[PDB]
Amino acid sequence: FQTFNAKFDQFSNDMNAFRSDFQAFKDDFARFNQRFDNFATK
Amino acid sequence: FQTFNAKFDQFSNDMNAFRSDFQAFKDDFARFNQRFDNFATK
Amino acid sequence: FQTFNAKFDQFSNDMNAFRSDFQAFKDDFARFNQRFDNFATK
Amino acid sequence: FQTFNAKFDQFSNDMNAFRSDFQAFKDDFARFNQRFDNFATK
């Protein structure tokens, strides 16, 4: 079980890095969407 | 094991918040894609 | 443990639905990116 | 428990493939965003 737990902790860290990378992309997308809306209005 | 279970419950909540954030982004993307298609047709 | 396992199976299904939703978005994004490249070339 | 562990290992592989697919999309998005910024400046 304690091998499994160490393996789970690594997995959890990987998934939390994934969550963070998605959060970064979501912010980059929001900035793009604002730039698009500015371009399209003009 | 019950330390692990508490840790898992927290992880599950984090992942379900991630799923929700992605769902929000998917909706924002759909709206953008519609606006793009409107702009490009015109 | 078997409560945990049932809980894990539900989580796994939720995560696999999330994976599928992302795959759908990735396809929608690819189609958008092609339409953009067509618009921008013209 | 060892049925569960085998099931977890499969899940972990699925999630790590998901992470990789997202990383690929993030790169594709970055390239698109650069192309957009080039188009919009001109």
Coordinates of N, CA, C and O in Angstrom, one line a residue:
Chain A
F1 N 0.8 -1.2 0.0 CA 0.0 0.0 0.0 C 0.8 1.3 0.0 O 0.5 2.3 -0.6
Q2 N 2.0 1.3 0.7 CA 2.8 2.5 0.8 C 3.6 2.8 -0.5 O 3.9 3.9 -0.7
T3 N 3.9 1.7 -1.2 CA 4.3 2.0 -2.6 C 3.2 2.7 -3.4 O 3.5 3.6 -4.2
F4 N 2.0 2.2 -3.3 CA 0.9 2.8 -4.0 C 0.7 4.3 -3.6 O 0.5 5.2 -4.4
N5 N 0.8 4.6 -2.3 CA 0.7 5.9 -1.8 C 1.7 6.9 -2.3 O 1.4 8.0 -2.7
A6 N 3.0 6.5 -2.3 CA 4.0 7.3 -3.0 C 3.7 7.5 -4.4 O 3.9 8.6 -5.0
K7 N 3.2 6.5 -5.1 CA 2.8 6.6 -6.5 C 1.7 7.6 -6.7 O 1.6 8.4 -7.7
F8 N 0.7 7.5 -5.8 CA -0.4 8.4 -5.8 C 0.0 9.9 -5.6 O -0.5 10.8 -6.3
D9 N 0.9 10.1 -4.6 CA 1.4 11.4 -4.4 C 2.1 12.0 -5.6 O 1.9 13.2 -6.0
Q10 N 2.9 11.2 -6.3 CA 3.5 11.7 -7.6 C 2.4 12.0 -8.6 O 2.4 13.1 -9.2
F11 N 1.4 11.1 -8.8 CA 0.3 11.4 -9.7 C -0.4 12.7 -9.3 O -0.8 13.5 -10.2
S12 N -0.8 12.9 -8.1 CA -1.4 14.1 -7.6 C -0.6 15.3 -8.0 O -1.2 16.3 -8.4
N13 N 0.7 15.3 -7.8 CA 1.5 16.4 -8.2 C 1.5 16.7 -9.7 O 1.4 17.8 -10.1
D14 N 1.5 15.6 -10.4 CA 1.4 15.7 -11.9 C 0.1 16.4 -12.3 O 0.1 17.2 -13.2
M15 N -1.0 15.9 -11.7 CA -2.3 16.5 -12.0 C -2.5 17.9 -11.5 O -3.1 18.7 -12.2
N16 N -1.8 18.2 -10.4 CA -1.9 19.6 -10.0 C -1.1 20.6 -10.9 O -1.5 21.7 -11.2
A17 N 0.0 20.1 -11.4 CA 0.8 20.8 -12.5 C 0.0 21.0 -13.8 O -0.1 22.1 -14.4
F18 N -0.8 19.9 -14.1 CA -1.7 20.0 -15.3 C -2.8 21.1 -15.0 O -3.0 22.0 -15.9
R19 N -3.4 21.1 -13.8 CA -4.4 22.1 -13.5 C -3.8 23.5 -13.7 O -4.4 24.4 -14.3
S20 N -2.6 23.7 -13.2 CA -1.9 25.0 -13.3 C -1.6 25.4 -14.7 O -1.8 26.6 -15.1
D21 N -1.2 24.5 -15.5 CA -1.0 24.7 -16.9 C -2.3 25.1 -17.6 O -2.3 26.0 -18.5
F22 N -3.4 24.4 -17.3 CA -4.7 24.8 -17.9 C -5.0 26.2 -17.4 O -5.5 27.1 -18.2
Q23 N -4.8 26.5 -16.1 CA -5.2 27.9 -15.6 C -4.4 29.0 -16.4 O -4.9 30.1 -16.7
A24 N -3.1 28.7 -16.7 CA -2.3 29.6 -17.5 C -2.9 29.8 -18.9 O -3.0 30.9 -19.4
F25 N -3.3 28.7 -19.5 CA -3.9 28.7 -20.8 C -5.2 29.5 -20.8 O -5.4 30.3 -21.7
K26 N -6.0 29.3 -19.7 CA -7.3 30.0 -19.7 C -7.1 31.5 -19.6 O -7.8 32.3 -20.3
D27 N -6.1 32.0 -18.9 CA -5.7 33.4 -18.8 C -5.2 33.9 -20.2 O -5.6 35.0 -20.7
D28 N -4.4 33.1 -20.9 CA -3.9 33.5 -22.2 C -5.1 33.6 -23.2 O -5.1 34.5 -24.0
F29 N -6.0 32.6 -23.0 CA -7.2 32.7 -23.9 C -8.0 33.9 -23.7 O -8.5 34.6 -24.6
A30 N -8.2 34.3 -22.4 CA -9.0 35.4 -22.1 C -8.4 36.7 -22.7 O -9.1 37.6 -23.2
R31 N -7.0 36.8 -22.7 CA -6.4 37.9 -23.2 C -6.6 38.0 -24.7 O -6.7 39.1 -25.3
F32 N -6.4 36.9 -25.4 CA -6.6 36.7 -26.8 C -8.1 37.1 -27.2 O -8.3 37.9 -28.1
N33 N -9.0 36.7 -26.4 CA -10.5 36.9 -26.7 C -10.7 38.4 -26.7 O -11.4 38.9 -27.5
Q34 N -10.1 39.1 -25.7 CA -10.2 40.5 -25.6 C -9.6 41.2 -26.8 O -10.2 42.1 -27.3
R35 N -8.4 40.8 -27.2 CA -7.8 41.3 -28.4 C -8.6 41.1 -29.7 O -8.7 42.0 -30.5
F36 N -9.2 39.9 -29.8 CA -10.1 39.7 -30.9 C -11.3 40.6 -30.9 O -11.6 41.2 -31.9
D37 N -11.9 40.8 -29.7 CA -13.1 41.6 -29.7 C -12.8 43.1 -30.0 O -13.6 43.8 -30.6
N38 N -11.6 43.5 -29.7 CA -11.1 44.9 -30.0 C -10.8 45.0 -31.5 O -11.2 46.1 -32.1
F39 N -10.2 44.0 -32.1 CA -10.0 44.0 -33.6 C -11.3 44.0 -34.4 O -11.4 44.7 -35.3
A40 N -12.2 43.1 -33.9 CA -13.5 42.9 -34.7 C -14.4 44.1 -34.5 O -15.2 44.4 -35.5
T41 N -14.4 44.8 -33.4 CA -15.2 46.0 -33.3 C -14.6 47.1 -34.2 O -15.4 47.9 -34.7
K42 N -13.3 47.1 -34.5 CA -12.7 48.0 -35.4 C -12.4 47.3 -36.7 O -13.3 47.0 -37.5
Chain B
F1 N -4.4 4.3 6.0 CA -5.3 4.4 4.8 C -6.3 5.6 4.9 O -6.7 6.2 3.9
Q2 N -6.7 5.9 6.1 CA -7.7 7.0 6.3 C -7.1 8.4 6.1 O -7.8 9.3 5.7
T3 N -5.8 8.5 6.4 CA -5.1 9.7 5.9 C -5.1 9.8 4.4 O -5.3 10.9 3.8
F4 N -4.9 8.6 3.7 CA -4.9 8.6 2.3 C -6.3 9.0 1.7 O -6.4 9.8 0.8
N5 N -7.3 8.5 2.4 CA -8.7 8.7 1.9 C -9.0 10.2 2.0 O -9.6 10.8 1.1
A6 N -8.7 10.9 3.1 CA -8.9 12.3 3.3 C -8.1 13.1 2.2 O -8.6 14.0 1.6
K7 N -6.9 12.6 1.9 CA -6.1 13.2 0.9 C -6.7 13.0 -0.5 O -6.7 14.0 -1.4
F8 N -7.2 11.8 -0.8 CA -7.9 11.5 -2.0 C -9.2 12.4 -2.2 O -9.5 12.9 -3.3
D9 N -10.0 12.6 -1.1 CA -11.2 13.4 -1.2 C -10.8 14.8 -1.6 O -11.5 15.5 -2.4
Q10 N -9.7 15.4 -1.0 CA -9.3 16.7 -1.4 C -8.9 16.7 -2.9 O -9.3 17.7 -3.6
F11 N -8.1 15.8 -3.3 CA -7.7 15.6 -4.7 C -8.9 15.6 -5.6 O -9.0 16.3 -6.7
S12 N -9.9 14.8 -5.3 CA -11.1 14.6 -6.1 C -11.8 16.0 -6.2 O -12.3 16.3 -7.3
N13 N -11.9 16.7 -5.1 CA -12.5 18.1 -5.2 C -11.7 19.0 -6.1 O -12.3 19.8 -6.8
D14 N -10.4 18.9 -6.0 CA -9.5 19.8 -6.9 C -9.8 19.5 -8.3 O -9.8 20.4 -9.2
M15 N -9.9 18.2 -8.6 CA -10.1 17.7 -10.0 C -11.4 18.1 -10.5 O -11.6 18.4 -11.7
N16 N -12.4 18.0 -9.6 CA -13.8 18.4 -10.0 C -13.9 19.9 -10.3 O -14.5 20.4 -11.3
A17 N -13.2 20.7 -9.5 CA -13.0 22.2 -9.8 C -12.3 22.4 -11.1 O -12.7 23.3 -11.9
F18 N -11.3 21.7 -11.4 CA -10.6 21.7 -12.7 C -11.6 21.4 -13.8 O -11.7 22.2 -14.8
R19 N -12.4 20.3 -13.7 CA -13.4 20.0 -14.7 C -14.3 21.1 -14.9 O -14.6 21.5 -16.1
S20 N -14.8 21.7 -13.9 CA -15.7 22.9 -14.0 C -15.1 24.1 -14.6 O -15.8 24.8 -15.5
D21 N -13.8 24.4 -14.4 CA -13.1 25.5 -15.0 C -13.0 25.2 -16.5 O -13.1 26.1 -17.3
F22 N -12.7 23.9 -16.8 CA -12.6 23.6 -18.3 C -14.0 23.8 -19.0 O -14.1 24.3 -20.1
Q23 N -15.0 23.4 -18.3 CA -16.4 23.5 -18.8 C -16.7 25.0 -19.1 O -17.3 25.3 -20.1
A24 N -16.3 25.8 -18.2 CA -16.5 27.3 -18.4 C -15.7 27.8 -19.6 O -16.2 28.5 -20.4
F25 N -14.5 27.3 -19.7 CA -13.7 27.7 -20.8 C -14.3 27.2 -22.1 O -14.3 27.9 -23.1
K26 N -14.8 26.0 -22.1 CA -15.4 25.4 -23.4 C -16.6 26.3 -23.8 O -16.7 26.5 -25.1
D27 N -17.4 26.7 -22.9 CA -18.5 27.6 -23.2 C -18.0 29.0 -23.8 O -18.5 29.5 -24.8
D28 N -16.9 29.5 -23.1 CA -16.4 30.8 -23.6 C -15.8 30.6 -25.0 O -16.0 31.5 -25.9
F29 N -15.2 29.5 -25.2 CA -14.6 29.2 -26.6 C -15.8 29.1 -27.6 O -15.6 29.7 -28.7
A30 N -16.9 28.4 -27.3 CA -18.0 28.3 -28.2 C -18.5 29.7 -28.6 O -18.9 29.9 -29.7
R31 N -18.6 30.6 -27.6 CA -19.1 31.9 -27.9 C -18.2 32.7 -28.8 O -18.7 33.4 -29.7
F32 N -16.9 32.6 -28.5 CA -15.8 33.2 -29.4 C -16.0 32.7 -30.8 O -15.9 33.5 -31.8
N33 N -16.1 31.3 -30.9 CA -16.1 30.7 -32.3 C -17.3 31.2 -33.1 O -17.1 31.5 -34.2
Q34 N -18.4 31.4 -32.4 CA -19.6 32.0 -33.1 C -19.3 33.4 -33.5 O -19.7 33.7 -34.6
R35 N -18.7 34.2 -32.6 CA -18.4 35.6 -33.0 C -17.4 35.7 -34.2 O -17.5 36.5 -35.1
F36 N -16.4 34.8 -34.2 CA -15.5 34.7 -35.3 C -16.2 34.4 -36.6 O -16.0 35.0 -37.6
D37 N -17.1 33.4 -36.5 CA -17.8 32.9 -37.8 C -18.7 34.1 -38.3 O -18.8 34.2 -39.5
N38 N -19.2 34.9 -37.4 CA -20.0 36.1 -37.8 C -19.1 37.2 -38.4 O -19.5 37.7 -39.5
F39 N -18.0 37.4 -37.8 CA -17.0 38.4 -38.4 C -16.5 38.0 -39.7 O -16.4 38.8 -40.7
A40 N -16.1 36.7 -39.9 CA -15.5 36.2 -41.1 C -16.5 36.1 -42.3 O -16.1 36.2 -43.4
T41 N -17.8 35.8 -41.9 CA -18.8 35.8 -43.0 C -19.0 37.2 -43.5 O -19.3 37.4 -44.7
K42 N -18.8 38.2 -42.7 CA -18.9 39.6 -43.0 C -17.5 40.2 -43.2 O -16.8 39.9 -44.1
Chain C
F1 N -12.5 0.2 2.8 CA -11.8 0.3 1.4 C -12.8 0.2 0.2 O -12.6 0.8 -0.8
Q2 N -13.8 -0.6 0.4 CA -14.7 -0.9 -0.7 C -15.7 0.3 -1.0 O -16.1 0.5 -2.1
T3 N -16.0 1.1 0.1 CA -16.6 2.4 -0.1 C -15.6 3.3 -0.9 O -16.1 4.0 -1.8
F4 N -14.3 3.3 -0.6 CA -13.4 4.1 -1.3 C -13.3 3.7 -2.8 O -13.3 4.5 -3.7
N5 N -13.3 2.4 -3.1 CA -13.2 1.8 -4.4 C -14.4 2.3 -5.3 O -14.2 2.7 -6.4
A6 N -15.6 2.2 -4.8 CA -16.8 2.7 -5.4 C -16.7 4.2 -5.7 O -17.1 4.6 -6.8
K7 N -16.2 4.9 -4.7 CA -15.9 6.4 -4.9 C -14.9 6.6 -6.0 O -15.0 7.6 -6.8
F8 N -13.9 5.8 -6.0 CA -12.8 5.9 -7.1 C -13.4 5.6 -8.4 O -13.0 6.3 -9.4
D9 N -14.2 4.6 -8.6 CA -14.8 4.2 -9.9 C -15.6 5.4 -10.4 O -15.6 5.7 -11.6
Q10 N -16.4 6.0 -9.5 CA -17.2 7.2 -9.9 C -16.2 8.3 -10.4 O -16.5 8.9 -11.5
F11 N -15.2 8.6 -9.6 CA -14.2 9.6 -10.0 C -13.6 9.3 -11.3 O -13.4 10.2 -12.2
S12 N -13.2 8.1 -11.5 CA -12.5 7.7 -12.8 C -13.5 7.9 -14.0 O -13.1 8.4 -15.0
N13 N -14.8 7.6 -13.8 CA -15.8 7.9 -14.9 C -15.9 9.4 -15.1 O -16.0 9.8 -16.3
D14 N -15.9 10.2 -14.1 CA -15.9 11.6 -14.2 C -14.8 12.2 -15.0 O -14.9 13.1 -15.8
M15 N -13.6 11.6 -14.7 CA -12.3 12.1 -15.3 C -12.3 11.6 -16.8 O -11.8 12.3 -17.6
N16 N -12.8 10.4 -17.0 CA -12.8 10.0 -18.4 C -13.9 10.8 -19.3 O -13.6 11.1 -20.4
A17 N -15.0 11.2 -18.7 CA -15.9 12.2 -19.3 C -15.2 13.5 -19.6 O -15.4 14.1 -20.7
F18 N -14.5 14.0 -18.6 CA -13.6 15.2 -18.8 C -12.7 15.0 -20.0 O -12.6 15.9 -20.9
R19 N -12.0 13.9 -20.0 CA -11.0 13.7 -21.1 C -11.7 13.7 -22.5 O -11.3 14.4 -23.4
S20 N -12.9 13.1 -22.5 CA -13.7 13.1 -23.8 C -14.2 14.5 -24.2 O -14.2 14.9 -25.4
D21 N -14.6 15.3 -23.2 CA -15.0 16.7 -23.5 C -13.8 17.5 -24.0 O -14.0 18.3 -24.9
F22 N -12.6 17.3 -23.4 CA -11.5 18.0 -23.9 C -11.2 17.5 -25.4 O -10.9 18.4 -26.2
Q23 N -11.3 16.2 -25.6 CA -11.0 15.7 -27.0 C -12.0 16.4 -28.0 O -11.6 16.8 -29.2
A24 N -13.2 16.6 -27.6 CA -14.2 17.3 -28.5 C -13.8 18.7 -28.7 O -13.9 19.2 -29.8
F25 N -13.4 19.4 -27.6 CA -12.9 20.7 -27.8 C -11.7 20.8 -28.7 O -11.6 21.7 -29.5
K26 N -10.8 19.9 -28.5 CA -9.5 19.9 -29.4 C -9.9 19.8 -30.9 O -9.3 20.5 -31.7
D27 N -10.9 19.0 -31.2 CA -11.4 18.9 -32.6 C -12.0 20.2 -33.0 O -11.8 20.7 -34.2
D28 N -12.8 20.8 -32.1 CA -13.5 22.0 -32.5 C -12.5 23.1 -32.7 O -12.6 23.9 -33.7
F29 N -11.4 23.1 -31.9 CA -10.3 24.1 -32.0 C -9.6 23.9 -33.4 O -9.3 24.9 -34.1
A30 N -9.3 22.6 -33.7 CA -8.6 22.4 -35.0 C -9.4 22.9 -36.1 O -8.9 23.4 -37.1
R31 N -10.7 22.7 -36.1 CA -11.6 23.2 -37.2 C -11.6 24.7 -37.3 O -11.5 25.3 -38.4
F32 N -11.7 25.4 -36.2 CA -11.6 26.8 -36.1 C -10.2 27.3 -36.6 O -10.2 28.3 -37.5
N33 N -9.1 26.7 -36.2 CA -7.8 27.1 -36.6 C -7.7 27.0 -38.1 O -7.1 27.9 -38.8
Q34 N -8.3 26.0 -38.7 CA -8.2 25.9 -40.2 C -9.0 27.0 -40.8 O -8.6 27.5 -41.8
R35 N -10.2 27.3 -40.3 CA -11.0 28.4 -40.8 C -10.3 29.7 -40.7 O -10.4 30.6 -41.6
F36 N -9.6 29.9 -39.6 CA -8.9 31.2 -39.4 C -7.8 31.3 -40.5 O -7.6 32.3 -41.1
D37 N -7.0 30.2 -40.7 CA -5.9 30.2 -41.6 C -6.4 30.5 -43.1 O -5.8 31.1 -43.9
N38 N -7.7 30.0 -43.4 CA -8.3 30.3 -44.6 C -8.7 31.7 -44.8 O -8.5 32.3 -45.9
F39 N -9.3 32.3 -43.7 CA -9.7 33.7 -43.7 C -8.5 34.6 -43.8 O -8.5 35.6 -44.6
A40 N -7.4 34.3 -43.0 CA -6.2 35.2 -43.0 C -5.4 35.1 -44.3 O -4.7 36.1 -44.6
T41 N -5.4 34.0 -45.0 CA -4.7 33.9 -46.3 C -5.4 34.7 -47.3 O -4.8 35.3 -48.2
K42 N -6.7 34.9 -47.1 CA -7.6 35.7 -48.0 C -7.9 37.0 -47.3 O -7.1 37.9 -47.1
Chain D
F1 N -7.3 -5.4 -3.2 CA -6.5 -4.1 -3.4 C -5.7 -4.1 -4.7 O -5.4 -3.1 -5.3
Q2 N -5.1 -5.3 -5.1 CA -4.2 -5.4 -6.2 C -5.0 -5.3 -7.5 O -4.4 -4.9 -8.6
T3 N -6.3 -5.7 -7.5 CA -7.2 -5.3 -8.7 C -7.3 -3.8 -8.8 O -7.2 -3.2 -9.9
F4 N -7.5 -3.2 -7.6 CA -7.6 -1.7 -7.6 C -6.3 -1.0 -8.1 O -6.4 -0.1 -8.9
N5 N -5.2 -1.5 -7.7 CA -3.9 -1.0 -8.1 C -3.7 -1.0 -9.6 O -3.3 -0.1 -10.2
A6 N -3.9 -2.2 -10.2 CA -3.9 -2.4 -11.7 C -4.9 -1.4 -12.3 O -4.5 -0.8 -13.4
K7 N -6.0 -1.2 -11.8 CA -7.0 -0.3 -12.3 C -6.5 1.2 -12.2 O -6.7 2.0 -13.1
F8 N -5.9 1.5 -11.1 CA -5.3 2.8 -10.9 C -4.2 3.1 -11.9 O -4.1 4.2 -12.4
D9 N -3.3 2.1 -12.1 CA -2.2 2.3 -13.0 C -2.7 2.6 -14.4 O -2.2 3.5 -15.1
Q10 N -3.8 1.9 -14.8 CA -4.4 2.2 -16.1 C -5.0 3.6 -16.2 O -4.7 4.4 -17.1
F11 N -5.7 4.0 -15.1 CA -6.2 5.4 -15.0 C -5.1 6.4 -15.0 O -5.2 7.4 -15.8
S12 N -4.0 6.2 -14.3 CA -2.9 7.1 -14.3 C -2.3 7.3 -15.7 O -2.0 8.4 -16.1
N13 N -2.2 6.2 -16.5 CA -1.7 6.2 -17.9 C -2.7 7.1 -18.7 O -2.3 7.9 -19.5
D14 N -4.0 6.9 -18.5 CA -5.0 7.6 -19.3 C -4.9 9.1 -19.0 O -5.0 9.9 -19.9
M15 N -4.7 9.4 -17.7 CA -4.6 10.8 -17.3 C -3.3 11.4 -17.8 O -3.3 12.6 -18.2
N16 N -2.3 10.7 -17.8 CA -1.0 11.2 -18.4 C -1.1 11.4 -19.9 O -0.6 12.5 -20.4
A17 N -1.8 10.5 -20.6 CA -2.1 10.8 -22.0 C -2.9 12.0 -22.3 O -2.7 12.9 -23.2
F18 N -3.9 12.2 -21.4 CA -4.7 13.5 -21.4 C -3.8 14.7 -21.2 O -3.9 15.7 -22.0
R19 N -3.0 14.7 -20.2 CA -2.0 15.8 -19.9 C -1.2 16.1 -21.2 O -1.1 17.3 -21.6
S20 N -0.7 15.1 -21.8 CA 0.1 15.2 -23.1 C -0.7 15.8 -24.2 O -0.2 16.7 -25.0
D21 N -2.0 15.4 -24.4 CA -2.8 15.9 -25.4 C -3.1 17.4 -25.1 O -3.1 18.2 -26.0
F22 N -3.3 17.8 -23.8 CA -3.5 19.2 -23.5 C -2.2 20.0 -23.8 O -2.3 21.1 -24.4
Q23 N -1.1 19.4 -23.5 CA 0.2 20.1 -23.8 C 0.4 20.4 -25.3 O 0.8 21.5 -25.7
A24 N -0.1 19.4 -26.1 CA 0.0 19.6 -27.6 C -1.0 20.7 -28.0 O -0.6 21.5 -28.8
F25 N -2.2 20.7 -27.4 CA -3.1 21.8 -27.8 C -2.6 23.1 -27.3 O -2.7 24.1 -28.1
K26 N -2.0 23.2 -26.1 CA -1.4 24.5 -25.7 C -0.4 25.1 -26.7 O -0.4 26.3 -26.9
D27 N 0.5 24.2 -27.2 CA 1.4 24.6 -28.2 C 0.7 25.1 -29.5 O 1.1 26.1 -30.1
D28 N -0.3 24.3 -29.9 CA -1.0 24.7 -31.1 C -1.7 26.0 -30.9 O -1.7 26.9 -31.8
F29 N -2.2 26.3 -29.7 CA -2.9 27.5 -29.4 C -1.9 28.7 -29.4 O -2.2 29.8 -30.0
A30 N -0.7 28.4 -28.9 CA 0.3 29.5 -28.9 C 0.7 29.9 -30.3 O 0.9 31.1 -30.6
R31 N 0.8 28.9 -31.2 CA 1.2 29.2 -32.5 C 0.1 30.0 -33.2 O 0.4 30.9 -34.0
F32 N -1.2 29.6 -33.0 CA -2.4 30.3 -33.5 C -2.3 31.8 -33.0 O -2.5 32.7 -33.8
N33 N -2.1 32.0 -31.7 CA -2.2 33.3 -31.1 C -1.1 34.2 -31.7 O -1.4 35.4 -32.0
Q34 N 0.0 33.6 -32.0 CA 1.1 34.4 -32.7 C 0.6 34.8 -34.1 O 0.9 35.9 -34.5
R35 N 0.0 33.9 -34.8 CA -0.5 34.2 -36.2 C -1.6 35.2 -36.2 O -1.6 36.1 -37.1
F36 N -2.4 35.1 -35.2 CA -3.5 36.1 -35.0 C -2.9 37.5 -34.8 O -3.2 38.5 -35.4
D37 N -1.9 37.6 -33.9 CA -1.3 38.9 -33.6 C -0.6 39.5 -34.8 O -0.5 40.7 -34.9
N38 N 0.0 38.6 -35.6 CA 0.6 39.1 -36.9 C -0.4 39.6 -37.9 O -0.2 40.7 -38.5
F39 N -1.5 38.9 -38.0 CA -2.6 39.3 -38.9 C -3.2 40.6 -38.4 O -3.5 41.5 -39.3
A40 N -3.5 40.7 -37.1 CA -4.2 41.9 -36.6 C -3.3 43.2 -36.6 O -3.8 44.3 -36.7
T41 N -2.0 43.0 -36.4 CA -1.1 44.1 -36.5 C -1.1 44.7 -38.0 O -0.9 45.9 -38.2
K42 N -1.3 43.8 -38.9 CA -1.3 44.1 -40.3 C -2.8 44.1 -40.8 O -3.6 45.0 -40.5

